[PDB]
């Protein structure tokens, strides 16, 4: 027989997972992390928490090359950041299958640089999808996995047995309150969302979201309100059609500022989410 192995996925994807170093003024390493080479142009996704307050960001490929990288953009909400390196002899890129839909139970491999020991691969499965993550009241779409994720894995890749990118490993449940240590609970930003964020970053330098004038279906805040909610809308009440579309959270941010949008229960201009 032949030994059971996910070496295929490793050979296909690991080469594109790089080690990220956030150095800060002499220049000293402030934090380690990982990153994924998305395409030949040299664009790399990583966690914003990894490259924050970096005086100089360095990327090191598994093939030995090392580059200084350009921070094209970052997003707090998604904790995503996009880097750029200018290679010339070709770059290894992460396999991406946009038609593939991750399923709970799919086998996955976490690829990163844990504690700077060097690139390591860990395997688990997709434990859940559509998870708000480590902290509620500020939901998101997270992928949950039990593939061992440690400090250093952030910004790295989560791939299936074919080497296809499933997500970008972000943080991990380190300790539930002041009591014990959770085991096998890690999160990753879904590749589909990371791709949509990367493109926005490459194009604008940041994510331009469409904000209007409400916070906290019904409409009412458990704390004060804002200005922009004075273009032609009531106080606290539900709504239906917004910009020739029946009821909506992700669509208002998807609209770019400057534009005027009609509402009901009749026009407002889109401001940028502060």
């Amino acid at each position: 027989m032949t030994p059971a192995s996910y070496n295929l996925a490793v050979r296909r994807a690991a080469p594109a997972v790089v080690n990220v170093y956030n150095r800060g003024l002499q220049l000293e390493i402030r934090t380690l992390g990982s990153g994924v080479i998305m395409d030949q142009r040299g664009y790399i996704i990583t966690n914003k928490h990894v490259i924050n307050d970096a005086d100089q960001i360095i990327v090191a490929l598994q093939d030995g090359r090392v580059f200084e990288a350009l921070l094209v953009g970052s997003d707090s909400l998604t904790d995503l950041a996009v880097l750029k390196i200018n290679a010339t002899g070709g770059l290894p890129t992460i396999p991406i299958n946009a038609r593939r839909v991750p399923h709970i139970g799919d086998v996955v491999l976490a690829i990163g640089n844990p504690y700077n020991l060097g690139q390591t691969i860990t395997q688990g499965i997709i434990s859940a999808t559509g998870r708000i993550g480590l902290n509620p009241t500020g939901r998101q779409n997270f992928l949950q996995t039990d593939a061992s994720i440690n400090h250093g894995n952030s910004g790295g890749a989560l791939v299936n047995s074919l080497g296809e990118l499933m997500g970008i490993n972000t943080l991990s449940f380190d300790k539930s309150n002041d009591g014990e240590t959770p085991e096998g609970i890690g999160f990753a930003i879904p590749f589909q969302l990371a791709t949509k964020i990367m493109d926005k970053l490459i194009r604008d330098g940041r994510v331009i979201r469409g904000y209007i004038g409400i916070g906290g279906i019904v409409v009412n805040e458990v704390s004060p309100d804002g200005p922009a909610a004075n273009a032609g809308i009531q106080v606290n009440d539900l709504i239906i059609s917004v910009d020739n579309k029946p009821a909506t959270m992700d669509q208002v941010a998807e609209i770019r500022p400057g534009s005027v949008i009609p509402v009901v229960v009749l026009q407002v201009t889109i401001q940028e989410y502060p």
Binding site: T137, Y211, G215, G216, V219
Partner: peptide, 4 residues
Amino acid sequence: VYWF
């Protein structure tokens, strides 16, 4: 919190 609906930050619409």
